[PDB]
Coordinates of C-alpha atoms and ligand atoms in Angstrom, one line a residue:
Chain A
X1 CA 0.3 -33.1 1.4
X2 CA 1.3 -29.8 0.5
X3 CA 0.9 -30.5 -3.2
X4 CA -2.9 -31.7 -2.8
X5 CA -3.4 -28.4 -0.6
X6 CA -2.2 -26.3 -3.4
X7 CA -4.4 -28.0 -5.8
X8 CA -7.2 -27.3 -3.1
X9 CA -6.5 -23.9 -2.9
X10 CA -7.9 -23.3 -6.4
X11 CA -4.8 -20.6 -6.9
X12 CA -2.9 -23.0 -9.3
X13 CA -3.6 -20.9 -12.5
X14 CA -2.4 -17.3 -13.4
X15 CA -2.7 -15.2 -10.6
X16 CA -3.7 -11.7 -11.2
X17 CA -2.3 -8.4 -9.2
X18 CA -4.8 -7.3 -6.2
Chain B
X1 CA 37.8 -17.9 8.4
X2 CA 36.0 -19.1 5.4
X3 CA 37.8 -17.5 2.5
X4 CA 41.8 -17.8 2.6
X5 CA 43.5 -15.0 1.0
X6 CA 43.3 -15.5 -2.7
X7 CA 39.5 -15.9 -2.6
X8 CA 38.9 -13.0 0.0
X9 CA 41.1 -10.6 -2.6
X10 CA 39.1 -12.3 -5.5
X11 CA 35.7 -11.9 -4.2
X12 CA 36.4 -8.1 -2.7
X13 CA 37.9 -7.2 -6.5
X14 CA 34.8 -8.7 -8.2
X15 CA 32.5 -6.6 -5.4
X16 CA 34.1 -3.1 -6.4
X17 CA 33.5 -4.1 -10.0
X18 CA 30.0 -4.1 -9.1
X19 CA 30.1 -0.6 -7.7
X20 CA 31.7 0.7 -10.9
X21 CA 29.5 -1.0 -12.9
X22 CA 26.5 0.3 -11.6
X23 CA 28.1 3.4 -11.5
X24 CA 28.2 3.8 -15.1
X25 CA 25.2 2.3 -15.6
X26 CA 23.4 5.0 -13.5
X27 CA 25.0 7.7 -15.3
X28 CA 23.6 6.3 -18.9
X29 CA 20.0 5.5 -17.7
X30 CA 19.9 9.1 -15.9
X31 CA 20.7 10.6 -19.1
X32 CA 17.8 8.7 -21.1
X33 CA 15.7 9.4 -18.2
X34 CA 15.9 13.1 -18.3
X35 CA 15.4 13.1 -22.3
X36 CA 13.1 10.2 -23.5
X37 CA 12.7 9.2 -26.9
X38 CA 9.7 9.4 -28.5
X39 CA 7.5 8.2 -31.8
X40 CA 10.5 6.2 -33.6
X41 CA 7.6 4.1 -36.1
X42 CA 4.4 4.3 -37.0
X43 CA 2.2 0.7 -37.1
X44 CA 1.9 0.6 -41.0
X45 CA 5.4 -0.7 -40.5
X46 CA 4.4 -3.8 -39.1
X47 CA 1.9 -6.6 -40.0
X48 CA 0.0 -7.6 -37.5
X49 CA 0.2 -11.5 -36.7
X50 CA -1.7 -12.6 -33.7
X51 CA -2.2 -12.0 -29.7
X52 CA -0.2 -13.2 -27.6
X53 CA -1.4 -11.5 -24.3
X54 CA -4.6 -9.6 -23.3
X55 CA -6.0 -8.5 -20.1
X56 CA -6.6 -5.3 -17.6
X57 CA -3.1 -4.5 -18.9
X58 CA -4.4 -4.2 -22.7
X59 CA -3.0 -6.4 -25.2
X60 CA 0.0 -7.7 -26.5
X61 CA 0.4 -8.8 -30.1
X62 CA 3.1 -10.5 -32.6
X63 CA 3.9 -7.8 -35.3
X64 CA 6.2 -8.3 -38.4
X65 CA 8.0 -5.3 -39.6
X66 CA 7.5 -5.2 -43.0
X67 CA 10.7 -4.6 -44.4
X68 CA 13.4 -6.3 -42.4
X69 CA 11.3 -9.0 -41.3
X70 CA 12.1 -9.2 -37.9
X71 CA 9.1 -10.2 -35.4
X72 CA 8.5 -7.8 -32.3
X73 CA 5.8 -8.1 -29.5
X74 CA 3.6 -4.9 -29.6
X75 CA 1.8 -3.4 -26.5
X76 CA -1.5 -1.5 -27.2
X77 CA -3.1 0.3 -24.7
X78 CA -6.1 2.1 -25.1
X79 CA -6.2 5.7 -24.1
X80 CA -9.4 6.3 -23.1
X81 CA -9.3 3.0 -21.3
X82 CA -6.3 3.8 -19.4
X83 CA -7.5 7.1 -18.7
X84 CA -10.6 6.0 -17.2
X85 CA -9.0 3.0 -15.2
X86 CA -7.0 5.7 -13.9
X87 CA -3.7 4.6 -15.1
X88 CA -1.7 7.3 -16.3
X89 CA 1.3 7.5 -14.6
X90 CA 2.1 4.1 -14.7
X91 CA 1.2 4.1 -18.4
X92 CA 3.5 6.9 -19.0
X93 CA 6.1 6.0 -16.2
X94 CA 6.1 2.3 -17.4
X95 CA 7.3 3.3 -21.1
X96 CA 10.0 6.1 -19.6
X97 CA 11.5 3.1 -17.6
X98 CA 11.8 1.0 -20.5
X99 CA 13.5 3.0 -23.1
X100 CA 16.0 4.3 -20.4
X101 CA 17.0 1.1 -19.0
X102 CA 19.9 -1.1 -20.8
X103 CA 20.1 -5.0 -19.1
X104 CA 20.5 -8.5 -20.5
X105 CA 17.3 -9.3 -19.0
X106 CA 15.2 -6.5 -19.4
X107 CA 13.5 -6.7 -22.0
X108 CA 14.1 -4.1 -25.2
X109 CA 11.7 -1.4 -26.1
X110 CA 12.5 -1.2 -29.6
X111 CA 10.4 1.2 -31.1
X112 CA 7.2 3.2 -29.5
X113 CA 4.5 5.5 -31.0
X114 CA 0.9 6.4 -30.4
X115 CA -1.6 7.7 -32.8
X116 CA -5.8 9.0 -32.7
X117 CA -6.4 5.8 -30.1
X118 CA -3.7 3.9 -29.0
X119 CA -0.3 3.8 -27.5
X120 CA 2.3 1.5 -28.8
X121 CA 5.1 -0.1 -26.9
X122 CA 7.5 -2.1 -29.4
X123 CA 9.3 -4.6 -27.4
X124 CA 11.6 -7.6 -28.9
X125 CA 9.6 -10.8 -29.5
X126 CA 10.3 -13.1 -26.4
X127 CA 9.3 -16.5 -28.2
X128 CA 9.7 -18.8 -25.1
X129 CA 6.6 -17.5 -23.5
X130 CA 6.0 -17.4 -19.6
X131 CA 8.1 -19.4 -16.9
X132 CA 4.8 -19.8 -15.3
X133 CA 3.5 -22.4 -18.1
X134 CA 6.9 -24.1 -18.1
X135 CA 6.9 -24.3 -14.6
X136 CA 3.4 -25.9 -14.1
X137 CA 4.0 -28.2 -17.1
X138 CA 7.0 -29.6 -15.9
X139 CA 5.8 -29.2 -12.1
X140 CA 8.9 -28.0 -10.1
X141 CA 12.5 -26.8 -11.5
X142 CA 15.6 -28.8 -10.1
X143 CA 17.6 -26.6 -7.8
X144 CA 19.9 -25.9 -10.4
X145 CA 17.6 -25.0 -13.1
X146 CA 16.1 -22.9 -10.5
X147 CA 19.3 -21.3 -9.4
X148 CA 20.3 -20.3 -12.7
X149 CA 17.0 -18.0 -13.1
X150 CA 17.1 -16.7 -9.6
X151 CA 20.7 -15.6 -10.4
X152 CA 19.3 -13.5 -13.0
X153 CA 16.9 -12.0 -10.9
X154 CA 19.3 -11.4 -8.3
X155 CA 21.3 -9.4 -11.2
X156 CA 18.6 -7.7 -12.6
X157 CA 17.0 -6.6 -9.1
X158 CA 20.8 -5.3 -8.2
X159 CA 20.9 -3.3 -11.4
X160 CA 17.3 -2.0 -11.1
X161 CA 17.9 -1.0 -7.2
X162 CA 21.3 0.7 -8.3
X163 CA 18.9 2.9 -10.4
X164 CA 16.4 3.4 -7.0
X165 CA 14.1 1.6 -8.9
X166 CA 11.9 -0.6 -7.1
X167 CA 10.2 -3.4 -9.2
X168 CA 7.0 -4.7 -7.2
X169 CA 5.6 -7.6 -9.8
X170 CA 7.8 -10.2 -9.8
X171 CA 6.2 -14.1 -10.7
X172 CA 6.5 -16.7 -12.9
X173 CA 3.6 -15.1 -15.0
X174 CA 6.1 -11.9 -15.2
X175 CA 9.2 -13.5 -16.5
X176 CA 9.5 -14.7 -20.2
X177 CA 12.1 -16.9 -21.6
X178 CA 13.9 -16.4 -24.7
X179 CA 15.6 -18.4 -27.6
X180 CA 18.4 -19.2 -25.1
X181 CA 16.9 -20.3 -21.8
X182 CA 17.7 -17.3 -20.3
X183 CA 14.8 -14.5 -18.5
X184 CA 13.6 -11.7 -19.7
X185 CA 11.4 -8.9 -17.3
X186 CA 8.9 -7.2 -19.3
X187 CA 6.0 -5.7 -16.8
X188 CA 7.2 -2.7 -15.6
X189 CA 3.4 -1.3 -14.5
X190 CA 4.6 -1.4 -10.9
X191 CA 7.9 -0.3 -11.3
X192 CA 8.8 3.4 -9.0
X193 CA 11.7 5.2 -8.6
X194 CA 12.3 4.8 -4.8
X195 CA 15.2 6.5 -2.9
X196 CA 13.6 6.0 0.3
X197 CA 10.2 4.6 1.3
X198 CA 7.1 4.1 -0.8
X199 CA 3.5 3.2 0.4
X200 CA 0.8 1.8 -2.6
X201 CA -0.9 -1.4 -2.0
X202 CA 0.2 -3.3 -4.9
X203 CA 1.2 -7.0 -6.2
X204 CA 0.2 -10.1 -6.2
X205 CA -1.3 -11.8 -3.0
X206 CA 1.1 -14.9 -2.8
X207 CA 4.2 -12.3 -3.6
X208 CA 3.2 -9.4 -1.3
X209 CA 5.7 -8.9 1.7
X210 CA 4.7 -8.4 5.1
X211 CA 5.1 -4.8 5.1
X212 CA 3.1 -4.0 2.4
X213 CA 0.3 -5.9 3.7
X214 CA 0.2 -4.4 6.9
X215 CA 0.1 -0.7 5.1
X216 CA 3.9 0.2 6.3
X217 CA 6.2 2.4 4.6
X218 CA 8.3 -0.1 2.5
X219 CA 11.3 0.4 0.5
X220 CA 13.6 -2.5 -2.1
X221 CA 13.7 -4.7 0.6
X222 CA 10.2 -6.0 -0.6
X223 CA 11.8 -7.1 -4.2
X224 CA 14.0 -9.5 -2.0
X225 CA 11.1 -11.0 -0.1
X226 CA 9.7 -11.8 -3.8
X227 CA 12.9 -13.5 -4.9
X228 CA 12.4 -15.5 -2.0
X229 CA 8.7 -16.7 -2.7
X230 CA 10.3 -17.0 -6.7
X231 CA 12.9 -19.3 -5.9
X232 CA 10.4 -21.3 -3.0
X233 CA 7.8 -21.8 -5.7
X234 CA 10.6 -22.5 -8.5
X235 CA 11.9 -25.5 -6.7
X236 CA 8.5 -26.6 -4.9
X237 CA 6.4 -26.2 -8.1
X238 CA 3.7 -24.0 -5.2
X239 CA 4.7 -21.1 -3.5
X240 CA 5.1 -20.8 0.2
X241 CA 2.0 -19.0 1.1
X242 CA -1.4 -20.2 -0.6
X243 CA -4.7 -20.4 0.3
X244 CA -8.8 -20.4 -0.7
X245 CA -8.6 -16.7 -0.3
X246 CA -6.1 -14.1 -0.2
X247 CA -6.9 -12.9 3.1
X248 CA -5.8 -16.2 4.7
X249 CA -2.7 -16.0 2.6
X250 CA -2.0 -12.5 3.8
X251 CA -2.1 -14.4 7.7
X252 CA 0.2 -16.7 6.8
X253 CA 2.7 -14.6 5.2
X254 CA 2.9 -12.1 8.3
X255 CA 3.0 -14.9 10.8
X256 CA 7.0 -15.3 10.3
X257 CA 6.4 -18.8 10.0
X258 CA 7.2 -20.8 6.6
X259 CA 7.1 -24.3 6.1
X260 CA 9.5 -26.3 3.3
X261 CA 9.2 -29.8 1.6
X262 CA 11.8 -32.5 2.1
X263 CA 13.4 -32.6 -0.4
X264 CA 14.7 -28.8 -0.6
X265 CA 18.3 -28.6 0.5
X266 CA 19.4 -27.4 3.9
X267 CA 21.6 -24.5 2.2
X268 CA 18.0 -23.6 0.1
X269 CA 16.1 -23.7 3.3
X270 CA 18.7 -21.4 4.6
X271 CA 18.6 -19.2 2.0
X272 CA 14.7 -18.8 1.6
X273 CA 14.4 -18.2 5.7
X274 CA 16.7 -15.1 5.3
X275 CA 14.8 -13.7 2.3
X276 CA 11.5 -14.5 3.7
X277 CA 12.3 -13.1 6.6
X278 CA 9.3 -10.5 8.1
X279 CA 12.0 -8.9 10.7
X280 CA 13.3 -6.0 8.4
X281 CA 16.2 -5.6 10.4
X282 CA 17.2 -9.7 9.4
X283 CA 16.2 -9.8 6.0
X284 CA 19.0 -10.2 3.5
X285 CA 19.2 -7.9 0.7
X286 CA 18.3 -5.0 3.6
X287 CA 21.5 -5.5 6.1
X288 CA 24.7 -3.5 5.9
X289 CA 26.2 -6.0 3.0
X290 CA 23.3 -5.2 0.8
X291 CA 22.8 -7.9 -2.4
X292 CA 26.3 -9.3 -1.3
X293 CA 24.5 -11.6 1.5
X294 CA 22.6 -13.0 -1.3
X295 CA 25.1 -13.9 -3.7
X296 CA 27.7 -15.0 -1.4
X297 CA 25.3 -17.6 0.4
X298 CA 26.5 -21.0 0.0
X299 CA 23.5 -21.8 -2.3
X300 CA 24.9 -19.7 -5.0
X301 CA 28.7 -21.1 -4.2
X302 CA 28.5 -22.4 -7.7
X303 CA 27.3 -19.4 -9.5
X304 CA 29.7 -17.5 -11.9
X305 CA 27.9 -14.1 -11.8
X306 CA 29.9 -12.3 -14.3
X307 CA 29.4 -15.8 -16.7
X308 CA 25.4 -15.2 -16.6
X309 CA 25.5 -11.8 -17.1
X310 CA 27.7 -12.3 -20.0
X311 CA 24.8 -15.3 -20.9
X312 CA 28.0 -17.8 -21.3
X313 CA 26.6 -20.6 -18.9
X314 CA 24.6 -22.6 -21.2
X315 CA 20.7 -23.0 -20.5
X316 CA 19.3 -26.0 -18.1
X317 CA 15.9 -25.7 -21.0
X318 CA 15.6 -24.4 -24.3
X319 CA 12.4 -23.6 -25.2
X320 CA 10.7 -25.3 -28.6
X321 CA 11.5 -22.8 -31.8
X322 CA 10.4 -23.6 -34.7
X323 CA 11.0 -20.6 -36.8
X324 CA 10.9 -16.5 -36.2
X325 CA 7.3 -16.2 -36.1
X326 CA 6.4 -19.2 -33.7
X327 CA 3.9 -18.2 -30.7
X328 CA 3.8 -22.0 -29.6
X329 CA 4.7 -21.1 -26.1
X330 CA 1.9 -18.6 -25.9
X331 CA -1.7 -19.3 -25.4
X332 CA -4.8 -18.2 -28.2
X333 CA -7.0 -15.5 -27.7
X334 CA -9.8 -14.1 -29.9
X335 CA -8.7 -11.6 -32.3
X336 CA -10.1 -7.9 -31.7
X337 CA -9.8 -5.4 -34.3
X338 CA -7.1 -2.4 -33.3
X339 CA -9.5 0.4 -34.2
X340 CA -8.1 3.7 -34.8
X341 CA -10.2 7.2 -34.5
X342 CA -10.0 9.8 -36.9
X343 CA -10.4 11.6 -34.1
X344 CA -7.7 12.7 -31.4
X345 CA -8.5 11.4 -27.6
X346 CA -6.4 12.2 -24.7
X347 CA -4.2 13.9 -26.5
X348 CA -2.9 16.0 -23.3
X349 CA -2.8 13.5 -21.2
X350 CA 0.0 11.3 -23.0
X351 CA 1.9 14.1 -24.3
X352 CA 4.5 12.3 -22.8
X353 CA 4.2 9.1 -24.5
Ligands
LIG401 O1 3.8 -12.4 -23.0 S1 3.6 -10.6 -22.7 O2 2.3 -10.5 -23.6 C1 4.6 -10.2 -23.5 C2 4.9 -9.0 -22.8 C3 6.0 -7.6 -23.2 C4 6.9 -8.1 -24.1 C5 7.3 -9.3 -24.7 C6 7.7 -10.1 -25.7 N1 7.7 -11.3 -26.3 C7 6.7 -11.7 -26.2 C8 5.6 -11.6 -25.1 C9 5.6 -10.3 -24.7 N2 3.3 -10.2 -21.1 C10 1.8 -9.4 -20.5 C11 1.7 -9.3 -19.2 C12 1.7 -10.7 -18.5 N3 3.2 -10.7 -17.6 C13 4.4 -11.0 -19.2 C14 4.4 -10.2 -20.4

């Protein structure tokens, strides 16, 4: 599912600027 | 047509009044922009309470004014560290913007000052914490809830863009919720006065517009792209473009393809396809009718823009608040010293602060 894909990305926490 | 006579006249009058408001607001901004305020308090006016945030951006501390008892959020930057990280211009510009703007969803700089070691920005304490926390906790916002927040961002960007300010740092991590449930925008380190184009690669991967990824000169339309990302993430619980590695996120962003959860309304999907439009000649907020293409879209048909601005709409969510010093909507961090050296550091660099 897309939610499961989101969890799999490992980018569910706070995201830093580049 | 879509509007009868009364509705068209009312909408036209509303749009003209916005122009009139923005012209006055630009006049007020430019006076403060040209003559910034400096040195309006000092450190021993405040008790240090707790660290609210810490990172590459320095530190933000909850402090209490000793004589009024008012709480504030004090951003502390180490002057030597700012110079080392090559952030002098961004630091000066952030404070200059904050002391010059005025809008109900932009955090208020109440005092600023510096000493031998550090720079200090004393801002209103926004006790509800980051939208990010509430979004991950609740999972996703219902469309009316998302819309309430989105409307405030639309108005704030309409204001900032009229001042020729591009924002460039939109994401749930950078939006705070106040005691009335309304949004506060706080971070202006990437904001820039830009009447035309600018070129810097800056932002957060999930929120980067395609023209930034592709190393183009770009304009304020990147903020309308980011609004699309934000609305999507608020309503879905995850952003439109994500992957294990930033390069894979960038491939998705530039592809021109975006896919939606089945619970998104058709009105929402139509708005998002027009904001998340790779083709700049077609992106809402970048066309002849400007912000009005967004404000007049069907998904915002129930939005009373003036009532949002006046903060007369009941918020969908009021964060828990047990007193003026409550920090329960923020994380806990290791408490570090606020060291002030006997010697002044980097005085020349920060004369303007
Ligand atoms: O929450 S903060 O520490 C913060 C900053 C500025 C003013 C604030 C006012 N009240 C609370 C927290 C505040 N924060 C730091 C950078 C990350 N994004 C959100 C702003």
